[PDB]
Structures are given as C-alpha cells and as structure tokens.
CSV table of C-alpha atoms and ligand atoms in Angstrom, one decimal:
chain,number,residue,atom,x,y,z
A,22,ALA,CA,77.6,121.8,95.9
A,23,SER,CA,77.3,125.1,97.6
A,24,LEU,CA,80.0,127.9,100.0
A,25,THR,CA,78.0,126.9,102.8
A,26,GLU,CA,77.7,123.0,102.2
A,27,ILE,CA,81.3,122.9,101.9
A,28,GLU,CA,82.9,125.0,104.1
A,29,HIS,CA,80.4,122.4,106.4
A,30,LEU,CA,81.6,119.5,105.2
A,31,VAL,CA,85.6,120.5,105.8
A,32,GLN,CA,84.1,120.5,109.9
A,33,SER,CA,82.7,117.9,109.7
A,34,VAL,CA,85.3,115.6,108.0
A,35,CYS,CA,87.7,117.3,110.6
A,36,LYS,CA,85.4,116.0,113.5
A,37,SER,CA,84.5,112.6,112.3
A,38,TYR,CA,88.6,112.0,112.2
A,39,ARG,CA,88.8,113.6,115.5
A,40,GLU,CA,85.8,111.2,117.1
A,41,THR,CA,88.2,108.2,115.4
A,42,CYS,CA,91.7,109.2,115.5
A,43,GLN,CA,92.8,106.1,117.6
A,44,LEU,CA,95.6,108.4,119.7
A,45,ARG,CA,95.0,112.2,120.4
A,46,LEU,CA,98.1,113.4,119.0
A,47,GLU,CA,99.0,115.8,121.5
A,48,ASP,CA,99.8,111.8,123.3
A,49,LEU,CA,101.7,110.7,120.4
A,50,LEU,CA,103.7,113.5,120.7
A,51,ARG,CA,104.7,113.4,125.2
A,52,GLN,CA,105.2,110.1,124.4
A,53,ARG,CA,108.2,111.3,122.0
A,54,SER,CA,110.9,111.2,124.9
A,55,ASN,CA,110.0,107.0,126.2
A,56,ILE,CA,112.8,105.5,123.9
A,57,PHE,CA,112.3,101.9,123.1
A,58,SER,CA,116.6,100.7,125.6
A,59,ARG,CA,119.6,99.2,123.6
A,60,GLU,CA,118.4,96.2,126.1
A,61,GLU,CA,114.6,95.9,124.7
A,62,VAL,CA,115.7,96.8,121.0
A,63,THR,CA,117.2,93.5,121.6
A,64,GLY,CA,114.7,91.7,122.9
A,65,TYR,CA,112.2,92.3,120.4
A,66,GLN,CA,115.1,91.1,117.6
A,67,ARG,CA,115.3,87.8,120.2
A,68,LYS,CA,111.5,87.1,119.4
A,69,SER,CA,110.6,84.6,116.7
A,70,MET,CA,109.8,86.1,113.5
A,71,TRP,CA,106.3,84.3,114.2
A,72,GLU,CA,105.7,86.1,117.2
A,73,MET,CA,106.2,89.9,115.9
A,74,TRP,CA,103.8,89.0,112.9
A,75,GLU,CA,101.5,88.9,115.0
A,76,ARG,CA,102.3,91.5,117.1
A,77,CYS,CA,102.4,94.1,114.4
A,78,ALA,CA,99.3,92.0,113.1
A,79,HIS,CA,97.6,93.0,115.9
A,80,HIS,CA,98.4,97.1,115.7
A,81,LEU,CA,97.6,96.6,111.9
A,82,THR,CA,94.3,95.3,112.6
A,83,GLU,CA,93.5,97.9,115.8
A,84,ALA,CA,93.8,100.3,113.5
A,85,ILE,CA,92.7,99.3,110.6
A,86,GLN,CA,89.3,99.3,113.1
A,87,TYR,CA,89.3,102.7,113.3
A,88,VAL,CA,89.6,103.4,110.3
A,89,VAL,CA,85.9,101.6,109.6
A,90,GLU,CA,84.8,103.9,111.8
A,91,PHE,CA,85.8,107.0,110.1
A,92,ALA,CA,84.2,105.6,107.6
A,93,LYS,CA,81.3,104.6,108.3
A,94,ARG,CA,81.0,108.4,110.3
A,95,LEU,CA,82.3,110.2,107.1
A,96,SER,CA,79.3,112.7,105.3
A,97,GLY,CA,78.2,110.0,102.6
A,98,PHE,CA,79.3,107.0,102.8
A,99,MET,CA,76.6,105.1,104.3
A,100,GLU,CA,74.6,106.8,101.5
A,101,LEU,CA,76.1,104.3,99.4
A,102,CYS,CA,74.9,100.7,99.0
A,103,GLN,CA,76.6,98.0,101.1
A,104,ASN,CA,79.2,96.8,98.1
A,105,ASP,CA,80.3,100.3,97.5
A,106,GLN,CA,81.3,100.4,101.4
A,107,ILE,CA,83.0,96.1,101.0
A,108,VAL,CA,85.7,97.7,98.0
A,109,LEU,CA,86.1,100.8,99.2
A,110,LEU,CA,87.5,99.8,102.5
A,111,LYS,CA,89.0,96.4,101.2
A,112,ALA,CA,90.8,99.5,98.7
A,113,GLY,CA,91.7,102.3,101.4
A,114,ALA,CA,91.9,101.4,104.7
A,115,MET,CA,95.0,99.6,104.4
A,116,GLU,CA,96.4,103.2,102.2
A,117,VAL,CA,94.2,105.7,104.9
A,118,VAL,CA,96.4,103.1,107.7
A,119,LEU,CA,99.8,104.1,105.9
A,120,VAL,CA,99.2,108.1,105.9
A,121,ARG,CA,97.4,107.9,109.2
A,122,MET,CA,100.6,106.4,110.9
A,123,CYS,CA,102.9,109.7,110.1
A,124,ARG,CA,101.2,111.4,113.2
A,125,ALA,CA,102.8,108.3,115.3
A,126,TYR,CA,106.3,109.4,113.6
A,127,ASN,CA,109.0,110.6,114.7
A,128,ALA,CA,111.0,111.7,111.8
A,129,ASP,CA,113.7,113.6,114.2
A,130,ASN,CA,115.2,109.9,115.4
A,131,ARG,CA,113.2,107.8,112.9
A,132,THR,CA,111.5,105.9,114.7
A,133,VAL,CA,108.0,104.9,114.9
A,134,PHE,CA,105.2,104.4,118.4
A,135,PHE,CA,104.8,100.6,118.7
A,136,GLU,CA,103.9,98.9,122.2
A,137,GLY,CA,103.8,101.9,124.7
A,138,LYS,CA,107.9,103.3,123.0
A,139,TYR,CA,109.1,104.7,120.2
A,140,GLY,CA,112.1,102.2,118.3
A,141,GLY,CA,113.7,102.6,115.3
A,142,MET,CA,113.9,100.6,112.3
A,143,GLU,CA,116.4,97.8,114.1
A,144,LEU,CA,113.0,96.6,116.5
A,145,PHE,CA,111.1,95.0,113.2
A,146,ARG,CA,114.2,92.8,112.0
A,147,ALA,CA,112.4,89.1,113.5
A,148,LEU,CA,109.9,90.1,110.7
A,149,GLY,CA,112.7,89.7,107.4
A,150,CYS,CA,111.1,92.1,105.2
A,151,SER,CA,113.4,95.0,105.9
A,152,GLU,CA,112.7,96.4,102.3
A,153,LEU,CA,109.0,96.8,103.4
A,154,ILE,CA,109.7,98.2,106.9
A,155,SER,CA,112.3,100.8,105.2
A,156,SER,CA,109.8,101.3,102.7
A,157,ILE,CA,107.3,102.4,105.5
A,158,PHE,CA,109.9,104.5,107.7
A,159,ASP,CA,110.8,106.7,104.3
A,160,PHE,CA,107.0,107.0,103.5
A,161,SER,CA,106.3,108.2,106.8
A,162,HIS,CA,109.4,110.1,106.7
A,163,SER,CA,107.8,112.1,103.4
A,164,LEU,CA,104.9,112.8,104.9
A,165,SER,CA,106.5,114.5,108.3
A,166,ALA,CA,108.1,117.1,105.7
A,167,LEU,CA,104.7,118.3,104.7
A,168,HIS,CA,103.5,118.9,108.4
A,169,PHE,CA,100.6,117.6,108.1
A,170,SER,CA,97.9,119.9,110.3
A,171,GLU,CA,95.3,117.3,112.0
A,172,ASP,CA,92.2,118.8,110.2
A,173,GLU,CA,94.4,118.5,106.4
A,174,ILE,CA,95.3,113.9,107.6
A,175,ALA,CA,91.1,114.5,108.1
A,176,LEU,CA,90.7,116.4,104.5
A,177,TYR,CA,93.4,114.5,103.0
A,178,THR,CA,92.0,110.7,104.2
A,179,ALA,CA,89.4,111.2,103.7
A,180,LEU,CA,90.0,111.2,99.7
A,181,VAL,CA,91.9,108.5,100.3
A,182,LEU,CA,89.1,106.8,101.2
A,183,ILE,CA,86.4,107.8,98.7
A,184,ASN,CA,88.2,107.1,95.3
A,185,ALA,CA,85.6,107.0,92.4
A,186,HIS,CA,88.3,104.4,90.5
A,187,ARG,CA,88.7,101.7,93.1
A,188,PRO,CA,87.9,98.3,91.2
A,189,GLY,CA,84.3,97.1,91.5
A,190,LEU,CA,82.3,99.7,92.2
A,191,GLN,CA,78.8,99.6,91.6
A,192,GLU,CA,77.7,102.7,92.4
A,193,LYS,CA,81.0,105.6,90.1
A,194,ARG,CA,79.0,107.9,89.7
A,195,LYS,CA,77.5,108.0,93.4
A,196,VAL,CA,81.2,107.7,94.6
A,197,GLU,CA,82.0,110.5,91.8
A,198,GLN,CA,80.4,113.2,93.3
A,199,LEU,CA,81.3,112.9,96.4
A,200,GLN,CA,84.9,112.9,96.0
A,201,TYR,CA,83.9,115.7,94.6
A,202,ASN,CA,82.9,117.8,97.4
A,203,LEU,CA,85.4,116.0,99.5
A,204,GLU,CA,88.3,117.5,96.8
A,205,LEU,CA,86.2,121.0,97.2
A,206,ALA,CA,86.8,120.1,101.2
A,207,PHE,CA,89.8,119.8,100.7
A,208,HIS,CA,91.2,122.1,98.1
A,209,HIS,CA,88.8,125.2,99.7
A,210,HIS,CA,90.8,124.9,103.7
A,211,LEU,CA,93.8,124.6,102.1
A,212,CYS,CA,93.4,127.9,100.5
A,213,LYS,CA,91.9,129.6,103.3
A,214,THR,CA,94.8,128.5,104.9
A,215,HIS,CA,97.6,129.2,102.4
A,216,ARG,CA,98.1,125.6,102.1
A,217,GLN,CA,97.8,125.4,98.0
A,218,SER,CA,101.4,123.8,98.5
A,219,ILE,CA,101.0,121.2,99.6
A,220,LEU,CA,99.4,119.4,96.8
A,221,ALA,CA,102.1,118.7,94.5
A,222,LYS,CA,104.2,117.4,97.7
A,223,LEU,CA,101.3,114.4,98.1
A,224,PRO,CA,102.5,111.3,97.9
A,225,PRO,CA,101.5,110.0,94.0
A,226,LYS,CA,99.0,107.3,94.7
A,227,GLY,CA,100.9,104.6,92.8
A,228,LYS,CA,103.0,104.7,96.1
A,229,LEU,CA,100.1,104.0,98.7
A,230,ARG,CA,99.7,101.7,96.4
A,231,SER,CA,102.4,99.9,96.1
A,232,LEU,CA,103.4,100.0,100.1
A,233,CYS,CA,99.8,97.9,100.3
A,234,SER,CA,101.0,95.3,97.8
A,235,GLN,CA,104.7,95.5,98.8
A,236,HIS,CA,103.0,94.4,102.0
A,237,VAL,CA,100.1,91.5,100.8
A,238,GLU,CA,103.3,89.9,99.0
A,239,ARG,CA,105.4,89.8,102.4
A,240,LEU,CA,102.5,88.3,104.5
A,241,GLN,CA,102.2,85.8,101.7
A,242,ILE,CA,106.2,84.9,102.2
A,243,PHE,CA,105.2,84.4,106.1
A,244,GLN,CA,101.7,82.6,105.7
A,245,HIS,CA,104.4,79.9,103.8
A,246,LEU,CA,106.9,79.4,106.1
A,247,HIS,CA,103.9,79.1,108.9
A,248,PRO,CA,100.6,79.4,108.1
A,249,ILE,CA,99.3,77.6,111.2
A,250,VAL,CA,100.2,81.2,113.4
A,251,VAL,CA,98.3,83.6,110.8
A,252,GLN,CA,94.7,80.9,110.9
A,253,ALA,CA,95.2,80.5,114.1
A,254,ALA,CA,96.9,83.4,115.8
A,255,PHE,CA,96.1,85.9,113.0
A,256,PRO,CA,93.1,88.4,113.6
A,257,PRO,CA,89.8,87.6,111.2
A,258,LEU,CA,89.9,91.4,109.9
A,259,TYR,CA,92.7,91.4,109.1
A,260,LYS,CA,93.0,88.1,107.1
A,261,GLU,CA,89.8,89.1,105.7
A,262,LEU,CA,91.7,92.2,103.3
A,263,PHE,CA,95.2,91.0,103.4
A,264,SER,CA,95.3,87.0,103.3
A,265,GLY,CA,94.7,84.6,100.7
A,266,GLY,CA,92.4,82.9,100.8
A,267,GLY,CA,91.1,84.9,104.1
A,268,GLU,CA,88.2,86.3,101.9
A,269,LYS,CA,86.0,84.1,103.2
A,270,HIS,CA,85.0,85.9,106.3
A,271,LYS,CA,83.0,89.4,106.4
A,272,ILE,CA,84.1,91.5,109.2
A,273,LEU,CA,83.2,94.6,107.5
A,274,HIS,CA,79.8,93.3,107.3
A,275,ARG,CA,79.7,92.9,110.8
A,276,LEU,CA,81.5,95.9,111.3
A,277,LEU,CA,79.3,98.1,108.9
A,278,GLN,CA,75.5,97.0,110.1
A,279,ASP,CA,76.1,97.4,113.6
A,280,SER,CA,74.8,100.6,114.8
B,301,92A,C1,98.0,106.8,113.9
B,301,92A,C2,98.0,106.2,114.7
B,301,92A,C3,96.7,105.1,114.1
B,301,92A,C4,98.9,105.4,113.8
B,301,92A,C5,99.4,103.8,114.8
B,301,92A,C6,100.0,103.1,113.9
B,301,92A,O1,101.5,103.4,113.9
B,301,92A,N1,99.8,102.2,113.2
B,301,92A,C7,101.2,101.4,112.8
B,301,92A,C8,100.4,100.1,112.5
B,301,92A,C9,100.8,99.0,111.5
B,301,92A,C10,101.2,97.2,111.5
B,301,92A,C11,102.3,97.5,111.0
B,301,92A,C12,102.2,97.8,109.6
B,301,92A,N2,103.2,97.0,108.6
B,301,92A,C13,104.3,95.5,109.4
B,301,92A,O2,104.3,95.8,111.0
B,301,92A,C14,104.8,94.9,108.4
B,301,92A,C15,105.0,93.6,108.7
B,301,92A,C16,103.3,92.9,107.9
B,301,92A,C17,103.4,92.8,106.8
B,301,92A,C18,102.3,92.9,105.8
B,301,92A,C19,101.4,92.9,106.5
B,301,92A,CL1,99.3,93.0,105.6
B,301,92A,C20,101.4,93.4,107.8
B,301,92A,C21,102.4,93.9,108.6
B,301,92A,C22,102.2,98.7,109.0
B,301,92A,C23,101.5,99.6,110.4
B,301,92A,C24,101.8,100.7,114.3
B,301,92A,O3,101.4,100.2,114.2
B,301,92A,N3,102.9,100.9,113.1
B,301,92A,C25,104.2,100.6,114.1
B,301,92A,C26,105.2,99.6,113.5
B,301,92A,C27,105.0,99.5,111.9
B,301,92A,C28,106.6,99.5,111.5
B,301,92A,C29,105.4,100.9,111.5
B,301,92A,C30,103.7,101.8,112.4
B,302,NA,NA1,105.5,113.4,111.6
C-alpha cells in the first residue's frame, strides 16, 4: 500500500466502527449519573443464578452481533474465504467485546452500564463467578486509564479481529496482508495524533485470551449445574461460540451470508 491508501483505510475503519458501535459514546456518558439504588442492587443479588446467566448471555450476544456487523463492514474481511471469516470471528468477537465495553465502564465509581443503569461488581454476585467478574472489571479499569478515543478503539479492535495467527486459517498469507495494512493504519493514526505512547500500555494478547478462557470455563461450570437452561434459554449464537458441544448451530454463516 501507499500513504493515501492508509489514510483512506483509517477513515474506512473508523466509519465501519461508528456504524456498528452499538451505543454511541455520548449516550453512555449521559447515563453515568443513572446508578442502581441499593435496593435495586439487592434485587439483582436476590435473582437466581440461572436467571442472571441468561440475562448476561443475552447482553453478550447483542454485543457480539454488532461485532459481526463490524467485521462484515471491515475493509477486506468479506474478501477472505468463509472458513477464515468464521475462524476469525469465533476467536476474536468476544475479545472485541471485552475491549469495546471499556466505553460502558466508569472508572470513577467502578461501574458498568447494564440494563439501563450503572452498577458495580456487587450487581453480578448471583452468577457465582466472582473471579471472572473482577477480572473483567480490572480489564476495563486498565483500558480506561489509556483514555482511548473512538478512532483508536476502532483501529485497535480491527486488529484484534484481523489476526493472522489464529489457528485454523486456510489463507494465512491473505490475512497477514490485511493485518499488515491495518497495522499501518493504526500506527499511522497514532503517529499523526502523537499517541504512540499507548503502544506499550496496550494489554498483551495473552490477557484477552485468558479472559475468554475464563468465560468458557465458568460457562461449563454453569452448564453442568443447569444444562436445560443453556439448551432452552441461551441465545443460539452464544451457544455456537462458547458452549460445548454447542458448535453444532451455524448462526454466523447466516449472519455473514445475508445482505
Ligand atoms: C461498547 C458496548 C458494546 C459495551 C456494552 C457492554 O457492556 N457489553 C458487555 C457484554 C458482556 C456481557 C457479559 C459478560 N460476562 C459476564 O456477564 C460473566 C458471565 C459470563 C461468563 C461466560 C460467558 Cl461466555 C458469558 C457470560 C461480559 C461482557 C456487557 O453487557 N457488560 C455488562 C455486564 C458484564 C459483567 C460486563 C459487561
Ligand atoms: Na472508560
């Protein structure tokens, strides 16, 4: 590529992200004052473990769907073969969500936007995975210190998804070329905005990998406790990406093929 193409890729990636960001940043900031009362927090704690899991699985699925749409709009993604598109999404969609949610996190009071209001870790105690919850909050606390702009999140999450090292890629060279151009765009934008200092503060890939593994592991614990809840009340896309043996569903293939 050349310089004019990279500048175009920067605006292309930032545009695809704005069209699929799920929640605009200003809308998330305007809600920061709206925090669950101590009686509303106790209500969430009084909910059953199985109800909190399906409510969280529903919100995770909604977020993942926007990441799929981000991928389809992402320059060069739909040119890859379908096997590679599915490998990249299965490996990275959750990782993109884990990065995106820092916008919905308030580092001042350590709360996240959940079901119309902001609440802390104590809101999710009924899940029975306090270690995973605190790892999630800590990860959002870390990214919040970086003070990401919307353009930086756009370019970073594009690279989280377009990773030529994902096992199972049939056209590794083709993903490499797309990843190299997206790297150039991200680094060129950081250079122009004088934000190259964030490169050393970005979390290691093994951290996002550890969070996704913690999610699958705690789901397997819950699935053992309430297998019918997962089969009957969890979204099909969620089961395809996280539940064994739930990969039998093909949701993503339909999501990608349409339009
Ligand atoms: C920029 C916007 C798109 C950000 C919008 C946004 O906030 N999305 C996330 C999605 C989400 C949902 C659930 C989790 N995990 C859990 O609840 C733990 C249980 C678990 C374990 C394993 C699996 Cl596989 C699935 C669930 C992680 C993330 C979100 O809604 N929240 C609110 C509550 C959680 C605790 C933090 C983040
Ligand atoms: Na933040």
